[PDB]
Amino acid sequence: QTFVWRSEIFECQSTDIQRFYSLLAIETERLGLGSKILGQAGHHPLYLLQSPGQKAGLPNLLISAGFHGEESAGPWGLLHFLSQLDGELFKRVNLSVLPLVNPTGFAKGHRFNELGENPNRGFFIENGKAKPGADTSAEGRILLEHAHLLQVASRDGILTCHEDVLMTDTYVYTFEPSQAPGRFSHSLRDALGQYFPIAADGDVDNCPVRSGVIFNHFDTSFESFLVRSGARVGCCSETPGQQPLDQRILANAAAMNTFVNMLAPE
């Protein structure tokens, strides 16, 4: 249940949520990002950070992390990604970020929130209308209440940064409007592949992984919801939890760089 690692990049425990929000505030402030508290989970804010001066003709990319509290390299990786950003990047992309969706899970190093709910499932779209259902977590309900904002924010792409806690090898879930995976899928999986071995062909969580990619597999996940809502492409990256935290942190940041690089090129 509880998973905790030490980060040397951040000189703290992976569950150090006070340190997390402190460093996230520093980056928000450095880059001039707008901060919007979508809601609170266990008196911890669920933020939507948006780059400044978002223009009509630039792609709208959304990056999300921390749906599952044990998959801590997502949020820390996002923090690492931001820390390397220049600000010039925002001249070519309207970047939005959900840095931590499950703070109560994150703070304790466990998958579910304090209520035992899975925040990554129960996102529905019924005859064009976004809505929660019987299995939506409190956080999921908070995000669904700002469905329009998040759909606009991810119009040109969604990247959610997960970890498969008991895996040693890496893989990606991708969504593209084609019969087979393309450059988009391959570049993101290659980015993770620079850090870890790619998962061999077979069933990972009852899904077929072919050449490091599970392609167009829809369920009630946040990324499935945003792709069905109109996001051009999608990715749910899966860094392996049995690897060292800092390597997973770097791999996550690397995938975010590749994601933004492809969809909003220099």
The answer to whether 144 touches 222, Cβ cutoff 8 Å, is: no
Report the alpha-carbon distance of residue 49 to residue 71 in Å, rounded.
20
List 101's β-bridge partners, or say none: none
| Inter-CA distances, 54 with 19, 91, 110, 243, Å | 29, 8, 35, 37
Distances (CA, A) of 213 to 50, 198, 231: 29, 9, 18
CB 220 within 8 A of CB 122: yes
Residues 6+ apart with CB under 8 A from 56: none
Alpha helices per DSSP H over the chain: 17-31, 73-84, 103-108, 138-145, 147-153, 183-193, 222-228, 245-263
238 assigned to active site: yes
Exposure on the CB side of residue 212, measured as CA atoms within 13 A: 24
For residue 64, give the 3-state DSSP assignment. Answer: strand
Q: Which residue has the tokens 């690692």?
A: 5
From the candidates 71, 117, 163, 238, which is the catalytic residue? 238
The residues assigned a catalytic role are 238
